[PDB]
Amino acid sequence: MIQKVITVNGIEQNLFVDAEALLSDVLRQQLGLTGVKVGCEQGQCGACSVILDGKVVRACVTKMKRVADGAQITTIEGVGQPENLHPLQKAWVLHGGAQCGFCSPGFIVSAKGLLDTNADPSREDVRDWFQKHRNACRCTGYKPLVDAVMDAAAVINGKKPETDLEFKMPADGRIWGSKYPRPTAVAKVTGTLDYGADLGLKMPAGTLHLAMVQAKVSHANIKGIDTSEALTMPGVHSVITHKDVKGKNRITGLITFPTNKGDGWDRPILCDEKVFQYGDCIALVCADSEANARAAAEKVKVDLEELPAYMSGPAAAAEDAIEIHPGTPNVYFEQPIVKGEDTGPIFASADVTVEGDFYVGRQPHMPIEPDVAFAYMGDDGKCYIHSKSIGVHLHLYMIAPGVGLEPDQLVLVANPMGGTFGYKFSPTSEALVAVAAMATGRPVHLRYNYQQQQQYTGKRSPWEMNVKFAAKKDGTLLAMESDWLVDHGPYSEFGDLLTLRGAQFIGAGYNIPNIRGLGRTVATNHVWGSAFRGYGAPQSMFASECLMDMLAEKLGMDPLELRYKNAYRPGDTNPTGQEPEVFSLPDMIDQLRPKYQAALEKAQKESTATHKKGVGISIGVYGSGLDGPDASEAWAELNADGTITVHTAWEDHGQGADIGCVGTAHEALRPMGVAPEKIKFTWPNTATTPNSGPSGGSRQQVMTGNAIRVACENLLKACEKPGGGYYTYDELKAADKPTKITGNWTASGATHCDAVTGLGKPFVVYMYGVFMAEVTVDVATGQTTVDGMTLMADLGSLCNQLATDGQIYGGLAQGIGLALSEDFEDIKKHATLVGAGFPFIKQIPDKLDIVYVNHPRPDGPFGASGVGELPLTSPHAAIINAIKSATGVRIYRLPAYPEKVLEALKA
């Protein structure tokens, strides 16, 4: 050990450290500076950026021996605090750069390092800086971050007053539709919002820290577990196995479809008889620290008989394949789509037909914050779980029978969280921590490292797809045929539903009177499927939107004009036979057309012999809601101090549940003139907030937005004075009148899609968009650079533009990753951010352009649709279409790795 006397955030610290210790650990654990965020732990994400003697360094890869006596360190806590914000922090808030907020301290610290060396950077300078310093963001698509740095620099340089970094009310006083900052922004930019791992460091002594004993093979029969060595290791309390589980030790898929051949109880909590995928948790070591628990977990011996594993859908779906879940066929669900007339004779007589085989793979969510959760036994006797769940009520029911608790005896709470992009539509660690808290009676905390985040949380499910179009010479679509195989890994939860998405979204956007198709779901031993933003659309629409360009090519028609010819218009129906609720695609195409023409001309003009430029188009469509008559609830409460709390379980992945609530409530409450700062939101809690539903299916703005609106309307009625005006809290209380008022809303016109035909009216609100990708392909290397993305977006009406701009930029960036670099195919190689193709800043163009063409929705609150998943529906199709435009080569199977593109170029 050594004494190190240094300065941290301007204060002399008399430090006692191990020379080998990581600066991140010292700062977080020894000094309580939890504003230093840790994600990847491998120097790849920059979340732990600190300034050390004028240089921006990643604290997770900086050992204390590299910290000189007398060194100066700055963390986010030293940059500024609430009530004392630095221009960079104010700018982040103004520009909405804090979505989940997990990368915000690291970006801001890094940015301060930049500005201290280059006071007046170009946008390009800012981008080069964040690239060099590995500052990664999964939420924002980077553009808002650069915006923020530029604005802060101008203030620091005296070129504009600091007061211009403060939001100015539109007054009208209307915050709906505005850039009003989100309530959580200040905490995020100051590092004072405690995420799951931060909470773990601030839990009491006697909290047990867990480590998972995980399967190191993909498929096995388990014979036994030997914990003897682990029990003797430092700090070890106990080891938990399936034997300690007090319930069924299974998670239920809960809404498993009746025609599913599986019962939906296939997923264990702790493996008992079988390993079903690499990473499966077989035991939990409870220890006094994460380090001690992990060390001991390595010594737990699992005796197993490895079995042949099926590592892809086609492999598992073979007629001969052995049942992974004995008693259930590997292909456990099929969804037909049967619209209009038989397609066979139509294809036979059509002027033109086209067909393609396409593949979209096992995209990893890659939030900067790896999975984390904790649990404890309350003094009330209930088991409390605090995690990254984005469906607290859903998860409660999915796990309660497995852990052996009645619904009333379990409470799930959503911690502030550093992104999920859908992986948290699934339980991950919740049942594990519950089991351990119940068994030990003590608080337990479980943090996954980045490898565990990659290998052992769910993934976008790969789809192998064949899609066909028949059309007239004039481009009119006559018929479509479709076949898709969904590789859902070993756990069935929502796999059937994902498969149904193919019936709803393959070929969405156009009038197609006649459809015959069949989706199939298959269990495999690759990673289990969890929702990934777009949930079936990124697969479905990659196929159909690529196929539309092939159709255009075959007709000798411009691909945008082919879409214009076919796009939804009054009278048309979508693939499930339902009338669209608005008709905005022709409008969007018409407004995009000149920008498209200009982009083509620029592409031709600026292409060289070695660097070929192209422009590609696609349409995206997706529902806002879960299928059928989805519903939400909110409570609007006048408090004693005149503030108003809007209680919901609107779960915040980081998308903006806070500002969604505040903005929607503010608009609903206008008659009573309620200032936005007086409106409070509630963190999701299954005991104390209503069942607003999960933040999945881009549904909360519509469902919970409506519920909030209704509740606020009902509060207004509760407060109304006879003769005009409104009663105060004290007045209502004096009259023994209610102050906490419920609102409910249901999408009553929606129906579930049929099990035989796929027909129905699954959502009452959809999101519609038109993408344009501009790319350059280096034909010597096969490397594609996305130089620009445009999204024409119909969101009905914007609750908040900082929120919606950010959502779209974030989705577009994930589109670039899905198109060019991302996958989780190799269990080891893809278990890091860099290995799995995470888009760093230079991979995302600065030119991300949005045009809102909003057609107010009959059923959305104040006309709003959702936005969440729209930007990831088909941007990767636009990009692939752009590569085709540039070079003449079509990539059918994502991602377009350079070697893959080169092989196609040279073929």
Q: Name the residues that contact Cl ion, by CB under 5 A.
A: 460, 532, 535, 891-893, 897-899
Residues 6+ apart with CB under 8 A from 247: 400, 401, 402, 403, 404, 405
**Strand 72-74 with 2-8, pairing:** parallel
Q: Which of residues 118-137 bind ligand FES (CB under 6 A)?
A: 137
Q: Which amino acid is at 905?
A: L
Q: Work out what residue 41 binds among Cl ion, ligand FES, none; the CB cut-off runs from 5 to 8 Å by kind.
A: ligand FES
Q: Work out what residue 899 binds among ligand FES, Cl ion, none; the CB cut-off runs from 5 to 8 Å by kind.
A: Cl ion
3-class DSSP state of 580: coil
| Interface residue with ligand FES, options 419, 443, 660, 743 (CB under 6 A) | 419
| Interface residue with ligand FES, options 17, 21, 48, 702 (CB under 6 A) | 48
Query: Binding site annotation covers 383?
Result: no
Segment interacting with ligand FES (CB under 6 A) among 36-44, 200-208, 454-462, 486-494: 36-44
Is 108 a binding residue for ligand FES by CB under 6 A? The answer is no
Residues 6+ apart with CB under 8 A from 323: 329, 330
Is 91 a binding residue for ligand FES by CB under 6 A? The answer is no
Query: Binding site annotation covers 48?
Result: yes
Q: From the CB of 47, what's the least distance to ligand FES, in Å?
A: 5
Kindly tell me which of 141 and 575 has the beta carbon lying closer to ligand FES: 141
- Does 869 qualify as catalytic in the annotation? yes
Q: Which entry of 77, 545, 651, 869 is annotated as an active-site residue?
A: 869
Alpha carbon distance 587, 593 (integer Å): 10
Residues 6+ apart with CB under 8 A from 138: 100, 103, 365, 366, 367, 368, 419, 421, 810, 813, 814, 838
Kindly tell me which of 177 and 495 has the beta carbon lying closer to Cl ion: 495
Q: Which of 325, 269, 701, 666 is nearest to 488 (CA)?
A: 325
Is 47 a binding residue for ligand FES by CB under 6 A? The answer is yes
Helices (H), 506-568: 537-555, 559-566
Alpha carbon distance 592, 637 (integer Å): 45
Q: Work out what residue 893 binds among Cl ion, ligand FES, none; the CB cut-off runs from 5 to 8 Å by kind.
A: Cl ion
Is 33 a binding residue for ligand FES by CB under 6 A? The answer is no
- Residue 153 CB neighbours (<10 A): 22
Is 138 a binding residue for ligand FES by CB under 6 A? The answer is yes
Strand order in the sheet with 611-623: 611-623, 766-778, 784-794, 848-852
Kindly tell me which of 555 and 891 has the beta carbon lying closer to Cl ion: 891
Q: Which of 798, 768, 762, 784 is nearest to 871 (CA)?
A: 768
Q: Work out what residue 214 binds among Cl ion, ligand FES, none; the CB cut-off runs from 5 to 8 Å by kind.
A: none
Q: Which of residues 342-381 bind ligand FES (CB under 6 A)?
A: 368
CA 97 to chain centre: 16
Residue 744: which H helix or E strand, with range?
strand 740-746
Q: What are phi and psi of 809, to 5 degrees?
A: -55, -45
| Interface residue with ligand FES, options 9, 75, 99, 499 (CB under 6 A) | 99
Q: What are phi and psi of 737, to 5 degrees?
A: -95, 150
Q: Which of 479, 447, 494, 469 is nearest to 196 (CA)?
A: 447
Q: Work out what residue 460 binds among Cl ion, ligand FES, none; the CB cut-off runs from 5 to 8 Å by kind.
A: Cl ion
Q: Which of residues 645-704 bind ligand FES (CB under 6 A)?
A: 654
Q: From the CB of 92, what's the least distance to ligand FES, in Å?
A: 10
Number of residues that bind ligand FES (CB under 6 A): 26
C-alpha angle 435-441-442 in degrees, rounded to nearest 5: 95
Angstrom distances, CA of residue 317 to CA of 207, 314, 556: 45, 5, 38
Q: From the CB of 889, what's the least distance to Cl ion, in Å?
A: 9
Angstrom distances, CA of residue 408 to CA of 56, 379, 477: 49, 14, 53
Q: Work out what residue 532 binds among ligand FES, Cl ion, none; the CB cut-off runs from 5 to 8 Å by kind.
A: Cl ion
C-alpha angle 890-892-895 in degrees, rounded to nearest 5: 100
| Interface residue with ligand FES, options 29, 43, 315, 732 (CB under 6 A) | 43
Which token pair is 839?
Answer: 């888009």
Q: Work out what residue 48 binds among Cl ion, ligand FES, none; the CB cut-off runs from 5 to 8 Å by kind.
A: ligand FES
Where do we find the tokens 């299916």? 697
Is 40 a binding residue for ligand FES by CB under 6 A? The answer is yes
Is 146 a binding residue for ligand FES by CB under 6 A? The answer is no
Kindly tell me which of 97 and 262 has the beta carbon lying closer to ligand FES: 97
| Interface residue with ligand FES, options 50, 71, 79, 103 (CB under 6 A) | 103
Query: Binding site annotation covers 386?
Result: no
Segment interacting with ligand FES (CB under 6 A) among 101-109, 151-159, 674-682, 838-846: 101-109
Query: Binding site annotation covers 103?
Result: yes
Q: Are 800 and 664 in contact (CB under 8 A)?
A: no
| Interface residue with ligand FES, options 26, 27, 45, 661 (CB under 6 A) | 45
Is 139 a binding residue for ligand FES by CB under 6 A? The answer is yes
Q: Which parts of this chain interact with ligand FES (CB under 6 A)?
A: 38-41, 43-48, 58, 60, 98-103, 137-140, 368, 418-419, 654
Catalytic residues, by residue number, are 869
Q: Which residues contribute to the annotated binding site?
A: 40, 45, 48, 60, 100, 103, 137, 139, 653, 869
Q: Which residues contribute to the annotated binding site for [2Fe-2S] cluster?
A: 40, 45, 48, 60, 100, 103, 137, 139
